[PDB]
Design a protein around this ligand. Sequence first.
Ligand SMILES: O=C1CNc2ccc(C(F)(F)F)cc2N1
Length: 113
Amino acid sequence: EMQLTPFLILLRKTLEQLQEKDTGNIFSEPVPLSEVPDYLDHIKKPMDFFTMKQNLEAYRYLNFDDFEEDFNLIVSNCLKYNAKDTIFYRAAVRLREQGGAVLRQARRQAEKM
Ligand SMILES: O=C1CNc2ccc(C(F)(F)F)cc2N1
């Protein structure tokens, strides 16, 4: 029951804060199938922050949960594909932790609207 423009402004800010936690920029673009050619064998919906930005501006995120679901996909795809003893897996754990705090505060702001 809120206005669209401030909500999208909030999602844009939140997406930027989430990208800021991905200091290695390993989640900024789709996992490159050129370097990971079997990635799609068990990853049924790849996700990344560039795709999320495209989805945002295409008005595909009209509630907080749909935005957060695609963030969670970035994390879960990485935990699924990569072995636990890899930098990639640990980076997804850290993103889940740091991004979770970003999302909780952003959702508080959206609920104020
Ligand atoms: O799960 C992931 C997360 N992103 C990523 C970037 C680059 C590469 C690679 F280019 F292959 F080094 C692999 C991955 N795998």
